[PDB]
Amino acid sequence: LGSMKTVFSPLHSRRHVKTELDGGLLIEPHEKPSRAETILARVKDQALGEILEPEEFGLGPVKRVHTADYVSFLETCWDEWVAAGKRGEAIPTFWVGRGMRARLPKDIDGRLGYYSLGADTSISDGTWEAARASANVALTAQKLVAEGERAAFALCRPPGHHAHADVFGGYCFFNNAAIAAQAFRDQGYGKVAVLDVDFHHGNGTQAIFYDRSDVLTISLHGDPDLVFPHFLGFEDETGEGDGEAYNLNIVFPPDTPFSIWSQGLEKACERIRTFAPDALVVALGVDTFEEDPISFFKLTSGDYLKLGKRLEQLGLPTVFTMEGGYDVDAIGVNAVNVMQGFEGKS
Amino acid sequence: SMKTVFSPLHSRRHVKTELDGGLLIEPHEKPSRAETILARVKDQALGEILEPEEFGLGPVKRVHTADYVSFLETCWDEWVAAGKRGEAIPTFWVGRGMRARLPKDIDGRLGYYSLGADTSISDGTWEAARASANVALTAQKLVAEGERAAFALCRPPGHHAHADVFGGYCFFNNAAIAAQAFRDQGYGKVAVLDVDFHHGNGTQAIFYDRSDVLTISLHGDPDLVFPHFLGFEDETGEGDGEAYNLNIVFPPDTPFSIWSQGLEKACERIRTFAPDALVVALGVDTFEEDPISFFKLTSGDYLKLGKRLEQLGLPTVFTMEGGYDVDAIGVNAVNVMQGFEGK
Ligand SMILES: NCCCNCCCCCB(O)O
Ligand SMILES: NCCCNCCCCCB(O)O
Ligand SMILES: [K+]
Ligand SMILES: [K+]
Ligand SMILES: [K+]
Ligand SMILES: [K+]
Ligand SMILES: [Mg+2]
Ligand SMILES: [Mg+2]
Ligand SMILES: [Mg+2]
Ligand SMILES: [Zn+2]
Ligand SMILES: [Zn+2]
């Protein structure tokens, strides 16, 4: 087929937390280093293309998307947590409930809650460094496409699409897709589209660009009435101000198969075609998989070949940022199938 | 003289886990709290002890929303039916920039209705919250019908609960429910004074736009402690309620000699308000040995607190809130009542 380059960090376990709050218990996290190891091993076994390590871009490009206070918090959170004498990993306990003030406090517990949307995303040693590397993985891929590649695969871990300008959660810290999209904008690309095919709503990407018409954000996902993130992702969220009609949410119910999901994909592709962007960022999750342990769609591994083919037909410079997908048995087959279908396999 | 209302049903709330510092720990708000106070009440022969009357959900719903009362009744069953294996703890909530919109899934509802993940729900939590509100309402009834004061030995506590938010070990706001009951019975003005170490954010929120119920709280600086996002001194009310909320904040290590200066400020605000009845949300987590709080009151200081409260000369309902050193919790709480009665 064709060839696609993949950017990856060799330190798969830089982020290495051991707890995630789930169903009232502290379990082993779903977003585990073996996710990245397994995808990388399938990239190599399939000879998808060249594999390279990220360039360091520093925090400059990260701060085009995230606030300075938030970027500082994530760097110091673990140290401050340990210094306050807590014995577990860093998990929020308290937050800005409805009727309370969106006011940044001093105490580390208060700041953890202020900056989070969920308690599923433990922070420990290495988390800051891992988030930085994953952002650099996305920016290296963006650089590859800007300098001539049709597409590149940013093997991001941790993922990013739930991260707001200053809110972390859903296993995400820095919004890698939004950082790559904004990097395209900063490099003179007039219009960028961000298409979120992870099972969950990309609420962070929607929020970051919500009042802007230069970045079109679209997400297909399970009904937030039923699943995370619960409080964004509904189809009536179409943008605000100049961003009115430049956000599109497409929602599906439990057990949705490719035959139906692909109708939503076609709707998203039509919206992209009318927008006529200059580059495309695909926030790629394969938690739409029929065996994914926390999601309820029914795509088969062969469906990811079809997804990649349909994405290529859009005809755009394309960066893929890796998001979710938690059946590690099949994560490599599924994610690399998208790249292979984009490159002509099917 | 002073009567105490106590429900043995409080023990139906007996959770095994509390999220604290990233770990699931033995909960601080444990059944021995109410039992140790009750044993001191009997040992000191403070007064008659009675069980609550059943007032139904009506008076509860004068303060809390109907959806929220409904949620608390079914939350545990819904949680078990969705296949969760632990106790019921919220994982996701309305983060900043998200919609305050009620979803269908149990996880989404838990987050919508909560302000923290420290308050696990399990079987019997609903029953105990109901009985605790009836304890407060029975104490209010005793006062309204002639008693100078009454002790509502509530467990679980209430002062962190908003009209439709739970957290901080609280589900129904027992103090607010008794306050609203005074108002519904023709008491023109009511004051609620919160001496628990933490801010009574639930009580503040419930009456925040009202001038007929004056809410005052002394507490540790929320920049430093729970509940973090309310309780600052610039929160004075809104609409008709501006100047009818007063927060008095203190830093770590504050002793009674300083804390009681804030108490005097509170009492003068009450004196000028001139209420027809007073509700005291009584926590003894201001105690020098409290495991989660940073004030330095002594057991003897609680006698001084109770005496000062009596000098306000008002019909007074005490609702039990916090206090987590179980060794001294009985001595401390009953010291307030005894200092009130003249000890
Ligand atoms: N395990 C809890 C169910 C919902 N939580 C999912 C975590 C964040 C979404 C993951 B993703 O790939 O967007
Ligand atoms: N344990 C960590 C501090 C925050 N948790 C306290 C919750 C409120 C209970 C205290 B009460 O008596 O008002
Ligand atoms: K999505
Ligand atoms: K937009
Ligand atoms: K207080
Ligand atoms: K008020
Ligand atoms: Mg703290
Ligand atoms: Mg399998
Ligand atoms: Mg759920
Ligand atoms: Zn996902
Ligand atoms: Zn307290």
Nearest-10 crossing angle of helices B326-341, B32-43: 40
Residues spanned by the domain of B150: 1-343
- Nearest residue CA, atom 9 of ligand 1? A170
Verify whether ligand 2 is closer than 6 Å to residue B322 (CB atom). Answer: yes
Q: To test ligand 2's pocket by mutation, which of B37, B119, B160 has the most ligand atoms within 8 angstroms of CB?
A: B160
Does any ligand 1 atom lie closer than 6 A to the CB of residue A222?
no
> What is the spatial distance between Cα B21 and Cα A94, in angstroms, rounded to a whole number?
11
Nearest-by-Cβ selection for B115 from A95, A224, A225: A95
Distance from CA of B153 to the nearest CA of A (A): 26
B234 to chain A, closest Cα gap in Å? 12
CATH number of the domain that residue A198 is part of: 3.40.800.20
What is the tally of structural domains in chain A? 1
Question: What is the b/e burial string over B29-65, where b = at least 16 CB atoms within 10 angstroms of the residue's CB?
Answer: bbbebbbbbbebbeeeebbeebebeebeeebbeebbe
Residue A27, beta-bridge partner list: A20
Residue A198 CB–ligand 1 contact under 6 Å: yes
In angstroms, the CA B204 to CA B189 distance is 15
In three state form, how does the secondary structure of chain A look? CCCCEEECCCCCCCCCCCCEEECCEEECCCCCCHHHHHHHHHHHHCCCCCEECCCCCCCHHHHCCCCHHHHHHHHHHHHHHHHCCCCCCECCCECCCCCCCCCCCCCHHHHHHHCECECCCCECCCHHHHHHHHHHHHHHHHHHHHCCCCEEEECCCCCCCCCECCEEECCECCCHHHHHHHHHHHCCCCCEEEEECCCCCCHHHHHHCCCCCCEEEEEEEECCCCCCCCCCCCCCCCCCHHHCCCEEEEEECCCCEHHHHHHHHHHHHHHHHHHCCCEEEEEECCCCECCCCCCCCEECHHHHHHHHHHHHHCCCCEEEEECCCCCHHHHHHHHHHHHHHHCCCC
- Ligand 1 pocket: which of A19, A157, A171, A172 to mutate (most atoms <8 Å of CB)? A171
In the reported structure, the alpha carbon of residue A222 is separated from the centroid of ligand 1 by a whole-number distance in angstroms of 11
Q: How far apart are CA A129 and CA A146, in angstroms?
A: 25
**Cα-flanking dihedrals φ and ψ of residue A52, to 5°?**
-140, 160
Resolution of this structure in Å: 1.8
Q: Which residues of B are annotated as a binding site for Zn(2+)?
A: 196, 198, 285
Gap from CA of A196 to ligand 4 centroid (Å): 13
Mutate to test the interface with A, among B17, B18, B93, B169 (most CBs of A within 10 A): B93
The Cα–Cα gap between B221 and B224 comes to: 5
Distances (CA, A) of B256 to A121, B248, B263, B286: 41, 14, 9, 9
Q: Answer positive or negative: Cα dihedral of B106, B111, B117, B122.
A: negative
Chain B residue at shortest CA distance from A19: B22
Q: Is A162 an active-site residue?
A: yes
Q: Does any ligand 2 atom lie closer than 6 A to the CB of residue B283?
A: yes
Task: Tell me whether A208 touches chain B (CB under 8 Å).
Answer: no
Mutate to test the interface with B, among A230, A234, A237 (most CBs of B within 10 A): A230
Neighbours of A262 (CB within 10 A): 17
Does the CB atom of residue B321 touch ligand 2 within 6 A? Answer: yes
Taking the C-alpha atoms of residue A123 and residue A146, their distance in angstroms, rounded to an integer, is 33
Determination technique used = X-ray
Nearest CB among A22, A94, A225 relative to B105 is that of: A225
